[PDB]
Amino acid sequence: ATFGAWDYGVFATMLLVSTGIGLWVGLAVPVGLSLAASFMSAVQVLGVPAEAARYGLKFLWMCAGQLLNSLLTAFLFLPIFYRLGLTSTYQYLELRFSRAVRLCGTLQYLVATMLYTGIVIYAPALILNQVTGLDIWASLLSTGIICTLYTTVGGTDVFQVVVMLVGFWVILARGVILLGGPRNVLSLAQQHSRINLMDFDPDPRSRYTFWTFIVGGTLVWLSMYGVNQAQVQRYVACHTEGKAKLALLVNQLGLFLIVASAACCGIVMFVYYKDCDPLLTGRISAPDQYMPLLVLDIFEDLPGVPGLFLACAYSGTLSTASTSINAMAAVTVEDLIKPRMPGLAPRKLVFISKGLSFIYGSACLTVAALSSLLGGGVLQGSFTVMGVISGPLLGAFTLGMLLPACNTPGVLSGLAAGLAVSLWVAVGATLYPPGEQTMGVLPTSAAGCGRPALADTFYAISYLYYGALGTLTTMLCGALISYLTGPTKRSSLGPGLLWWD
Ligand SMILES: [I-]
Ligand code: NA
Ligand code: NA
Question: Which fold would CATH assign to domain 5-375?
């Protein structure tokens, strides 16, 4: 399970070329594909195939969970932000409830993005460690060095999406060629119940079901695209509000393609490891090393393909991390400092921007190391952190956008309660992980070569519900206390803020 001779050279050369091009640069369909490219880091490459291989093909419902998300963002959140010409999405909060809510929302965005970028830095480290033969910590150090060179020197997404999706297609083609024909692969996956699209298991403990996707995944993708900062800023830069919607729908098509290719590569990966499954044989340690192992195993006759594909999947996600870190620094120095501080020359402010970029780089690397220590689940971990933090923020946004009677006390108390409950599940589900069989992990073979009351019912809910469980309560708490301290008469909101218009 190591690169080899022709693969190390290709990996090194491609990484050097990627860094050189990125720095040399530093010193409406394109945007649609850039939006998806953002969240197509190594996290998805390592998670979606593994989840599809383990839990079956129900993971395709994720696409639906994104589709229903985009529609909402297309027809419920895009008009409000776009028609108001908001410089920052969280400026809405300031115009709606108060500047304190703007501050809290910006802080939640910063923390959530920091954790998510830490996990996005962890995943490439996982790739490098699993494929080269370096301990997780030396690989994490190398990943941090490269990410900081990208960020603290100088900040194409269409190219990344195209190249990595073509890599997915090539992996799938080679795999299905090896296993015979596509009909044989489909029948083999069908024998072991890997083709189970129709899974309406009502219970919420099941990790992946129709309800779980349509609700939790929809709300999480909403709090990752609908009310995010970078995505909304990309929207508002377009024209006439039609180009924005077309960019959003093209982004949705790109996401559909990426996640469907990944969910099919997962099934190919399983059918490949039908017997002598690497996981319960000691060949790999966690169910996130599946994809690099598949890449190495299938292309054990092509001297170069592993290096090219993994170098791309590494450099593109490091670029994503640098972009997220720089956006974090920019929003901090635009929405929190400059409004607060009277006014400072263009030198001190760029120096503060560099300082915040560096600080966020270090904090994200530290979060990556913490994720490495705790365990795995780059996909699960990223969704967990993002949902857990940004869910109540999305609840605040939705309460402001669709409920007239809502004031600052309501939103703030709702955020407090939502973060409380969301972290309750986020931790109580980490101290007492749910059983592998309650999560519905499909069977496998390897012969071819509840202590507390709530750990069994409430901490076991699907990891896609956490954010939802936050958002909903934020709406229900904020709706309640707001109506207690006093309703907010609708004749106080001026321009279009409520969507009831
Ligand atoms: I995904
Ligand atoms: Na990602
Ligand atoms: Na994700």
Answer: Sodium/glucose cotransporter (1.20.1730)
